[PDB]
Amino acid sequence: ATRILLLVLAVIIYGTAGFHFIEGESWTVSLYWTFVTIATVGYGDYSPSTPLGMYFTVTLIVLGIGTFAVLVERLLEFLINREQMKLMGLIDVAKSRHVVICGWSESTLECLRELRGSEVFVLAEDENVRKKVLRSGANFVHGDPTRVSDLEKANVRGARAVIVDLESDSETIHCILGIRKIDESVRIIAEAERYENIEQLRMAGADQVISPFVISGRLMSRSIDDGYEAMFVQDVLAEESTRRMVEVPIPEGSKLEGVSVLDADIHDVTGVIIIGVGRGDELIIDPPRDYSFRAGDIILGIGKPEEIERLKNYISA
Amino acid sequence: ATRILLLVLAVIIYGTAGFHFIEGESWTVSLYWTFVTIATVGYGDYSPSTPLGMYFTVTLIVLGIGTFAVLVERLLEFLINREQMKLMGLIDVAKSRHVVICGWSESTLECLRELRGSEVFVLAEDENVRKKVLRSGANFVHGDPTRVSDLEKANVRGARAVIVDLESDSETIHCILGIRKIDESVRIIAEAERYENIEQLRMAGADQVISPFVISGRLMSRSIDDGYEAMFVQDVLAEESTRRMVEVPIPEGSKLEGVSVLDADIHDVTGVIIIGVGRGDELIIDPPRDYSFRAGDIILGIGKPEEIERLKNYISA
Amino acid sequence: ATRILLLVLAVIIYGTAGFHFIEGESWTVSLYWTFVTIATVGYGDYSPSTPLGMYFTVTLIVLGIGTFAVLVERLLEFLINREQMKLMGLIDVAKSRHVVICGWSESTLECLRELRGSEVFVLAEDENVRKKVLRSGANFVHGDPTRVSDLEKANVRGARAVIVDLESDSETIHCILGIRKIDESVRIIAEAERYENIEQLRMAGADQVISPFVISGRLMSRSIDDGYEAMFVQDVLAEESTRRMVEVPIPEGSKLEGVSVLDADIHDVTGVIIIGVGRGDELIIDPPRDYSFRAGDIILGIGKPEEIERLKNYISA
Amino acid sequence: ATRILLLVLAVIIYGTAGFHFIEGESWTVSLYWTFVTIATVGYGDYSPSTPLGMYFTVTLIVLGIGTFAVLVERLLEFLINREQMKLMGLIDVAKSRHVVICGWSESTLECLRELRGSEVFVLAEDENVRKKVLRSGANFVHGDPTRVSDLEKANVRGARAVIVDLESDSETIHCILGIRKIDESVRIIAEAERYENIEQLRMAGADQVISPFVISGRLMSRSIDDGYEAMFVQDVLAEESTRRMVEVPIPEGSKLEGVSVLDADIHDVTGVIIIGVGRGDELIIDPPRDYSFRAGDIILGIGKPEEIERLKNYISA
Amino acid sequence: DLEKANVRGARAVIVDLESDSETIHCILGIRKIDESVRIIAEAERYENIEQLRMAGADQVISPFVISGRLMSRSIDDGYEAMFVQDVLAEESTRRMVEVPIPEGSKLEGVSVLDADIHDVTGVIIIGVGRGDELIIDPPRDYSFRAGDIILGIGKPEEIERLKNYISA
Ligand SMILES: [K+]
């Protein structure tokens, strides 16, 4: 790989040792003339005069052209190899705050619209998935999400969060186990098809589990007659037509520390229905009137975009 | 992406600030000498004389070669990426009067022979379809005809007309709905397999619907005994052996405005059987003898190539 | 496609019209200086002296570098397109004495070992067939053997002979009909699976028909008890272990014109069993003793390589 | 392929014969000037003065640029062809001490972790296998392991050892027969699925046969109640948790030649259970107390990594 | 569908599916039904051997892991693979047997050094499994008990010579 460097150094030395070993001009001007001749710069300050000397000049010119040809050849081969290799995946990830996505479905396409295109890496192995991901605007890594060896290629260790949605619950569980084998602190978000596997996904190590099929089946099984819960669910979580479920935190101080919910009256002040207060990875749905707010708490509620703004400004210090 | 421009500007500045900061020749000739040295032009009008100066010349030459190498590398990488990307589709369309074709069957191959090869764009996603389209002489765009996002890549908004012929009537209806979601005025031409979907294609928004299977089934169901309607249909619409169904418009004035059909006697004058007169997106089959011709009307008839010429010249002003 | 030629001519003109329109040296030396400056040759005989003139030199150098970049870009794009296109087929054939092979099976692989690798063209459309053909040492053309349009890409018109062996007898018959539609004189060699299609292949236009399955089934149906005909067939036609069925023609004169078979006694003279004499596309198996030899006749017999040599030298003039 | 060399020699001759046939300077300086002009070196010592002469210089410059373009074109085409061809296999092997692997399964992936990545060559034909092998870190050769023609591409003749593990026992037997057809001395290591084919693999020519399915079935059929043999087998051969089955040879002399096992007491001295002594391709399990050690014998035993070290140092001279 | 096969009451369950993911899922499902049934699983990859044991498998078999290592050593020597094949796969001449110690057996409390099972019968004693643990190469101070299982390799003749020898 470094043989070409030795070859070109030999040619440069061979050239330099021609002037001094022929006309004996100067051991310093020979070094220069050899460098200007190879780079075709051709000043012409010091040109040969003997027939032997000018013949040696032709030999040096053709040898320099031959060396350049090999130089260009090596580079071109390297560029072709790199481009051909990194086009179909087979490239290690060097980032440290990306988002790794295992598998590609319609659920992972909808979360790509709220995430940066250059920070998400999709880890699959199908060929059509590569084209779909490239059209979507993400980066494709060729590997098996269930393999620990291919999980380190995607740099799961340093990822901000990992989203697991594979073709089957068995594969999802295996991928979660593999990720937890690498990093025990990375955040994992999984999707469950069957109701039986919701607890197994949580036991494997998933931080958050989503059950779209379980939600949709129950919504279908109640909308045959009434169809009012499904309407609320659709208009609040799917379309966000008018209202929206927001989660706004409480800043430092906020002039609302220690104030109870009964004295705050967030509904009567802003118009946002307070569902619960999440204090440190636990959701207290419908907190009592005796609950006291703190710093860093997150308020979960449903309201219009106007009322959400009315609340975020209201809880400011 | 523009780091190389800064690097080369730094090298040029570094070179220029060598003459003045070493030999102090001239702040204007230094700029020149640095440019002729990098482009290997090597005039030689102003060559260095000090050993330090000629060493700096070698340093500048090798640095310029290194900069050129990176320059060539970047370009080559860009060209490889562009060619590799636009070979398999994944390219947005910038035209504004093309013809978009969704799907690829034998029906869309026969309409390619009467259309310009460079104005038709085929929107599919199969790999064999790409080779078939390239052999036919059209442009291939990789996308799903049913997706509104992939429909905008083909630039349906600005297309002259869109031809929809997919693998199923469900896909055809979905594609028509998607196209009408983008543009409500573009002309859509669809093909229907089942007789039940002819009305659904028209309700979705298709301007023209063609039912080859419905026509062929009825032709088969009558040719068991007689086989005379099928012979006429084949020899007039499929082969155009002797006669042909032509639609010639009436130019401005044409010396035939207000003249009734009974007084015109187009059959007795030219020999072309007049089927109907299309006046503004409606076909009046067998117009009455009291019908009065106008300007911009289209005459639909069946005749030999000789009689068609005899009629087009007859209706001229 | 020729815009770059206009651009470079404009740059050359712009350069040439600088010397005369600035320093007014000579309308002939300006043309020269502009050509030596672009090709980085840089003699230096006529270098600028005014600051404006040397600035214009830098402008010309950078413009020439920009023009060269586009020049290299266009070429590279053309080469990439050509290589990428002619790698997967999609290339028209310009030869006029090649051998076209439709389909790829084990039968067409055994006939490749007795034919020149560079004269055979294989016309298929599967991807694995391309790799198999390339490993074998032939040229691959991507097309459908049943399509007349793709048959002209392989240049069947000018082919020496066409060998048809497709996946089914229906496809073989269709390909023969298509070839006969193009050229009514080219030689077609087909292979038949079923016994019912031997006559249909000959009616379609095939010059020679081979029935390996029909031969093998009958050989199997007789070797259950005796197995002596199959042994002869294998050892003479498949392996050519000891003997071989040869067909040697009769040269001009040959000192054997008009001599009857009874007076020639080819068996008693050389040891080759004379099966038949093919005189003008007809095989006379076991010719009578009254048959008279002629010029241009072909002798069909089975003999050892020694006896074949003994006969070819015997029938020489 | 060598036409370009003739073309460039013609251009060089044409250039050289310009000076002497025009200005008649010198038959030696013309050769030089032609070489410096083509390589754009442009010294300028001998520049033309006549208008005709300087026109001829422009003609030579443009002809040299045209020749260079073709030169670059040919090289680029060669590099593209080489890279495109050797990327998907289709490359002959020139090594003489590699390890050829036929087929790719989980068994051949585990033996890649104890072998050098650059000496193993995998011979398959599936496309996914190529990506798997490239990710693993080996070299991929595209061919059919059952074909003798594709077996010579992998250079089985000169291989150190061949490992055969295909999708079926029929394919494994066929590959072994093909390899033995090429080389009768190369070492073959095969894997058997069925118990019926263990003897057929040995009769075909396999030096060593492995039966993972046969071992696992019997281990399953005994672990239903006891499960103690399977525990030993797993912990000694699969995981090598604590102990390990080692095979250490006896060096020259070793101070243990002719010493009987009863007097050596290898178990009482080191702690390694002596299973057997392999003397020349035969395993003597549980050798008698009267057995006498020799030179070049291999000791097979199970022991901890400490006891193995205690034994290897003990048997040293 | 696991309850249709009546896994609850099964004597033992053998899990060998098309993939390690499916094997792990099946083991988890079986352990969800019955926490005491005996599960015997098979592992393809070396990474999943520990995950199968954590899921609840009582015994794990790694045929691919064994065969890969046997292939990776038989390129030059090929003596360990020969022993493994002839003892575990074909059982040509010898065989690895596991014979228990009956009640009393006239060998309770007798140390291995005083028993000398190799010098008496000819069977190489690999280890003694006392209650779901294998003591490979027990010390000379080990004392036999009742219900222990002796693991060794010997000919069918020597196995008979040992089973009759350890009888009361
Ligand atoms: K140059």
PDB file of N, CA and C in Angstrom, chain B residues 18-70:
ATOM      1  N   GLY B  18       4.782  34.662   0.002  1.00  0.00           N
ATOM      2  CA  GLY B  18       6.119  34.120   0.121  1.00  0.00           C
ATOM      3  C   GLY B  18       7.154  35.011  -0.532  1.00  0.00           C
ATOM      4  N   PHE B  19       6.865  35.472  -1.749  1.00  0.00           N
ATOM      5  CA  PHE B  19       7.789  36.331  -2.478  1.00  0.00           C
ATOM      6  C   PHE B  19       8.047  37.629  -1.724  1.00  0.00           C
ATOM      7  N   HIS B  20       6.972  38.317  -1.350  1.00  0.00           N
ATOM      8  CA  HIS B  20       7.074  39.581  -0.629  1.00  0.00           C
ATOM      9  C   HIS B  20       7.672  39.422   0.766  1.00  0.00           C
ATOM     10  N   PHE B  21       7.416  38.280   1.397  1.00  0.00           N
ATOM     11  CA  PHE B  21       7.920  38.023   2.743  1.00  0.00           C
ATOM     12  C   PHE B  21       9.260  37.291   2.752  1.00  0.00           C
ATOM     13  N   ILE B  22       9.899  37.202   1.590  1.00  0.00           N
ATOM     14  CA  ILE B  22      11.186  36.526   1.483  1.00  0.00           C
ATOM     15  C   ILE B  22      12.190  37.366   0.703  1.00  0.00           C
ATOM     16  N   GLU B  23      11.911  37.556  -0.583  1.00  0.00           N
ATOM     17  CA  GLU B  23      12.777  38.342  -1.452  1.00  0.00           C
ATOM     18  C   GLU B  23      12.236  39.760  -1.600  1.00  0.00           C
ATOM     19  N   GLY B  24      10.956  39.933  -1.289  1.00  0.00           N
ATOM     20  CA  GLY B  24      10.316  41.231  -1.384  1.00  0.00           C
ATOM     21  C   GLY B  24      10.400  41.819  -2.778  1.00  0.00           C
ATOM     22  N   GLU B  25      10.108  40.996  -3.781  1.00  0.00           N
ATOM     23  CA  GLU B  25      10.149  41.437  -5.170  1.00  0.00           C
ATOM     24  C   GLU B  25       9.092  42.504  -5.436  1.00  0.00           C
ATOM     25  N   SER B  26       7.834  42.080  -5.477  1.00  0.00           N
ATOM     26  CA  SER B  26       6.720  42.989  -5.721  1.00  0.00           C
ATOM     27  C   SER B  26       5.416  42.346  -5.266  1.00  0.00           C
ATOM     28  N   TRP B  27       4.580  43.115  -4.577  1.00  0.00           N
ATOM     29  CA  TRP B  27       3.313  42.585  -4.091  1.00  0.00           C
ATOM     30  C   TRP B  27       2.349  42.252  -5.221  1.00  0.00           C
ATOM     31  N   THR B  28       2.686  42.605  -6.461  1.00  0.00           N
ATOM     32  CA  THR B  28       1.836  42.308  -7.606  1.00  0.00           C
ATOM     33  C   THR B  28       2.363  41.125  -8.413  1.00  0.00           C
ATOM     34  N   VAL B  29       3.685  40.957  -8.465  1.00  0.00           N
ATOM     35  CA  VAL B  29       4.284  39.878  -9.242  1.00  0.00           C
ATOM     36  C   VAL B  29       4.222  38.592  -8.430  1.00  0.00           C
ATOM     37  N   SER B  30       4.020  38.713  -7.122  1.00  0.00           N
ATOM     38  CA  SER B  30       3.949  37.537  -6.256  1.00  0.00           C
ATOM     39  C   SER B  30       2.640  36.810  -6.489  1.00  0.00           C
ATOM     40  N   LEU B  31       1.590  37.591  -6.684  1.00  0.00           N
ATOM     41  CA  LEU B  31       0.267  37.065  -6.946  1.00  0.00           C
ATOM     42  C   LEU B  31       0.262  36.290  -8.256  1.00  0.00           C
ATOM     43  N   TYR B  32       0.946  36.839  -9.250  1.00  0.00           N
ATOM     44  CA  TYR B  32       1.061  36.231 -10.558  1.00  0.00           C
ATOM     45  C   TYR B  32       1.884  34.948 -10.477  1.00  0.00           C
ATOM     46  N   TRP B  33       3.111  35.051  -9.985  1.00  0.00           N
ATOM     47  CA  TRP B  33       3.977  33.885  -9.875  1.00  0.00           C
ATOM     48  C   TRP B  33       3.329  32.721  -9.138  1.00  0.00           C
ATOM     49  N   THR B  34       2.573  33.015  -8.101  1.00  0.00           N
ATOM     50  CA  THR B  34       1.859  31.958  -7.402  1.00  0.00           C
ATOM     51  C   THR B  34       0.809  31.289  -8.272  1.00  0.00           C
ATOM     52  N   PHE B  35       0.120  32.048  -9.125  1.00  0.00           N
ATOM     53  CA  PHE B  35      -0.865  31.467 -10.026  1.00  0.00           C
ATOM     54  C   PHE B  35      -0.248  30.690 -11.177  1.00  0.00           C
ATOM     55  N   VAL B  36       0.870  31.158 -11.740  1.00  0.00           N
ATOM     56  CA  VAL B  36       1.484  30.404 -12.828  1.00  0.00           C
ATOM     57  C   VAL B  36       2.139  29.129 -12.307  1.00  0.00           C
ATOM     58  N   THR B  37       2.669  29.154 -11.083  1.00  0.00           N
ATOM     59  CA  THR B  37       3.300  27.968 -10.516  1.00  0.00           C
ATOM     60  C   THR B  37       2.302  26.859 -10.208  1.00  0.00           C
ATOM     61  N   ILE B  38       1.132  27.197  -9.671  1.00  0.00           N
ATOM     62  CA  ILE B  38       0.124  26.187  -9.372  1.00  0.00           C
ATOM     63  C   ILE B  38      -0.409  25.521 -10.638  1.00  0.00           C
ATOM     64  N   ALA B  39      -0.674  26.294 -11.690  1.00  0.00           N
ATOM     65  CA  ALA B  39      -1.185  25.760 -12.945  1.00  0.00           C
ATOM     66  C   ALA B  39      -0.082  25.189 -13.828  1.00  0.00           C
ATOM     67  N   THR B  40       1.038  24.868 -13.215  1.00  0.00           N
ATOM     68  CA  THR B  40       2.135  24.242 -13.910  1.00  0.00           C
ATOM     69  C   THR B  40       2.519  24.927 -15.220  1.00  0.00           C
ATOM     70  N   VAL B  41       2.007  26.129 -15.443  1.00  0.00           N
ATOM     71  CA  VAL B  41       2.344  26.832 -16.673  1.00  0.00           C
ATOM     72  C   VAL B  41       3.835  27.126 -16.737  1.00  0.00           C
ATOM     73  N   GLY B  42       4.435  27.512 -15.622  1.00  0.00           N
ATOM     74  CA  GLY B  42       5.867  27.698 -15.597  1.00  0.00           C
ATOM     75  C   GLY B  42       6.565  28.560 -16.623  1.00  0.00           C
ATOM     76  N   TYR B  43       6.149  29.808 -16.769  1.00  0.00           N
ATOM     77  CA  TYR B  43       6.809  30.694 -17.709  1.00  0.00           C
ATOM     78  C   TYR B  43       8.309  30.747 -17.472  1.00  0.00           C
ATOM     79  N   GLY B  44       8.704  31.104 -16.256  1.00  0.00           N
ATOM     80  CA  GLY B  44      10.104  31.229 -15.903  1.00  0.00           C
ATOM     81  C   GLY B  44      10.658  32.635 -15.940  1.00  0.00           C
ATOM     82  N   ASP B  45       9.803  33.649 -16.092  1.00  0.00           N
ATOM     83  CA  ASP B  45      10.281  35.027 -16.135  1.00  0.00           C
ATOM     84  C   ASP B  45      10.934  35.427 -14.817  1.00  0.00           C
ATOM     85  N   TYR B  46      10.282  35.040 -13.721  1.00  0.00           N
ATOM     86  CA  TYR B  46      10.732  35.338 -12.366  1.00  0.00           C
ATOM     87  C   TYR B  46      10.970  34.081 -11.545  1.00  0.00           C
ATOM     88  N   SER B  47      12.166  33.525 -11.641  1.00  0.00           N
ATOM     89  CA  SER B  47      12.502  32.310 -10.923  1.00  0.00           C
ATOM     90  C   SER B  47      13.315  32.629  -9.675  1.00  0.00           C
ATOM     91  N   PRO B  48      13.168  31.836  -8.616  1.00  0.00           N
ATOM     92  CA  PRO B  48      13.937  32.093  -7.395  1.00  0.00           C
ATOM     93  C   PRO B  48      15.418  31.826  -7.594  1.00  0.00           C
ATOM     94  N   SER B  49      16.232  32.516  -6.796  1.00  0.00           N
ATOM     95  CA  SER B  49      17.680  32.348  -6.832  1.00  0.00           C
ATOM     96  C   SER B  49      18.285  31.884  -5.517  1.00  0.00           C
ATOM     97  N   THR B  50      17.729  32.272  -4.374  1.00  0.00           N
ATOM     98  CA  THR B  50      18.251  31.814  -3.099  1.00  0.00           C
ATOM     99  C   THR B  50      17.907  30.340  -2.886  1.00  0.00           C
ATOM    100  N   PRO B  51      18.764  29.595  -2.178  1.00  0.00           N
ATOM    101  CA  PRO B  51      18.414  28.198  -1.867  1.00  0.00           C
ATOM    102  C   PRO B  51      17.127  28.070  -1.072  1.00  0.00           C
ATOM    103  N   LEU B  52      16.910  29.001  -0.149  1.00  0.00           N
ATOM    104  CA  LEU B  52      15.691  29.016   0.643  1.00  0.00           C
ATOM    105  C   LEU B  52      14.501  29.261  -0.282  1.00  0.00           C
ATOM    106  N   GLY B  53      14.642  30.229  -1.187  1.00  0.00           N
ATOM    107  CA  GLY B  53      13.584  30.541  -2.130  1.00  0.00           C
ATOM    108  C   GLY B  53      13.232  29.394  -3.051  1.00  0.00           C
ATOM    109  N   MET B  54      14.235  28.658  -3.538  1.00  0.00           N
ATOM    110  CA  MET B  54      13.957  27.534  -4.422  1.00  0.00           C
ATOM    111  C   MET B  54      13.446  26.309  -3.674  1.00  0.00           C
ATOM    112  N   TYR B  55      13.714  26.260  -2.372  1.00  0.00           N
ATOM    113  CA  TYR B  55      13.205  25.195  -1.527  1.00  0.00           C
ATOM    114  C   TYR B  55      11.718  25.496  -1.349  1.00  0.00           C
ATOM    115  N   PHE B  56      11.405  26.751  -1.023  1.00  0.00           N
ATOM    116  CA  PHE B  56      10.017  27.174  -0.877  1.00  0.00           C
ATOM    117  C   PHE B  56       9.236  26.919  -2.159  1.00  0.00           C
ATOM    118  N   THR B  57       9.908  27.015  -3.308  1.00  0.00           N
ATOM    119  CA  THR B  57       9.260  26.692  -4.577  1.00  0.00           C
ATOM    120  C   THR B  57       8.878  25.217  -4.638  1.00  0.00           C
ATOM    121  N   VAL B  58       9.772  24.338  -4.179  1.00  0.00           N
ATOM    122  CA  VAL B  58       9.463  22.909  -4.144  1.00  0.00           C
ATOM    123  C   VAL B  58       8.315  22.637  -3.181  1.00  0.00           C
ATOM    124  N   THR B  59       8.330  23.302  -2.023  1.00  0.00           N
ATOM    125  CA  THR B  59       7.233  23.154  -1.071  1.00  0.00           C
ATOM    126  C   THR B  59       5.907  23.601  -1.674  1.00  0.00           C
ATOM    127  N   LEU B  60       5.897  24.739  -2.367  1.00  0.00           N
ATOM    128  CA  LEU B  60       4.698  25.206  -3.047  1.00  0.00           C
ATOM    129  C   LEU B  60       4.237  24.245  -4.133  1.00  0.00           C
ATOM    130  N   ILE B  61       5.166  23.674  -4.900  1.00  0.00           N
ATOM    131  CA  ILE B  61       4.798  22.726  -5.946  1.00  0.00           C
ATOM    132  C   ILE B  61       4.150  21.481  -5.352  1.00  0.00           C
ATOM    133  N   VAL B  62       4.749  20.912  -4.305  1.00  0.00           N
ATOM    134  CA  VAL B  62       4.171  19.703  -3.723  1.00  0.00           C
ATOM    135  C   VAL B  62       2.838  20.013  -3.045  1.00  0.00           C
ATOM    136  N   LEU B  63       2.708  21.188  -2.421  1.00  0.00           N
ATOM    137  CA  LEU B  63       1.431  21.558  -1.818  1.00  0.00           C
ATOM    138  C   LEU B  63       0.356  21.760  -2.880  1.00  0.00           C
ATOM    139  N   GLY B  64       0.722  22.350  -4.020  1.00  0.00           N
ATOM    140  CA  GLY B  64      -0.233  22.504  -5.104  1.00  0.00           C
ATOM    141  C   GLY B  64      -0.662  21.173  -5.691  1.00  0.00           C
ATOM    142  N   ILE B  65       0.276  20.235  -5.821  1.00  0.00           N
ATOM    143  CA  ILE B  65      -0.087  18.895  -6.270  1.00  0.00           C
ATOM    144  C   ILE B  65      -1.029  18.227  -5.274  1.00  0.00           C
ATOM    145  N   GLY B  66      -0.751  18.356  -3.975  1.00  0.00           N
ATOM    146  CA  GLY B  66      -1.652  17.807  -2.977  1.00  0.00           C
ATOM    147  C   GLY B  66      -3.039  18.417  -3.021  1.00  0.00           C
ATOM    148  N   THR B  67      -3.125  19.736  -3.209  1.00  0.00           N
ATOM    149  CA  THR B  67      -4.414  20.398  -3.360  1.00  0.00           C
ATOM    150  C   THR B  67      -5.155  19.949  -4.613  1.00  0.00           C
ATOM    151  N   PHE B  68      -4.440  19.777  -5.718  1.00  0.00           N
ATOM    152  CA  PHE B  68      -5.078  19.306  -6.934  1.00  0.00           C
ATOM    153  C   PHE B  68      -5.623  17.917  -6.721  1.00  0.00           C
ATOM    154  N   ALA B  69      -4.860  17.054  -6.061  1.00  0.00           N
ATOM    155  CA  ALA B  69      -5.345  15.702  -5.811  1.00  0.00           C
ATOM    156  C   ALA B  69      -6.692  15.689  -5.102  1.00  0.00           C
ATOM    157  N   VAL B  70      -6.837  16.527  -4.082  1.00  0.00           N
ATOM    158  CA  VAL B  70      -8.089  16.623  -3.348  1.00  0.00           C
ATOM    159  C   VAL B  70      -9.173  17.206  -4.249  1.00  0.00           C
TER     160      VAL B  70
END
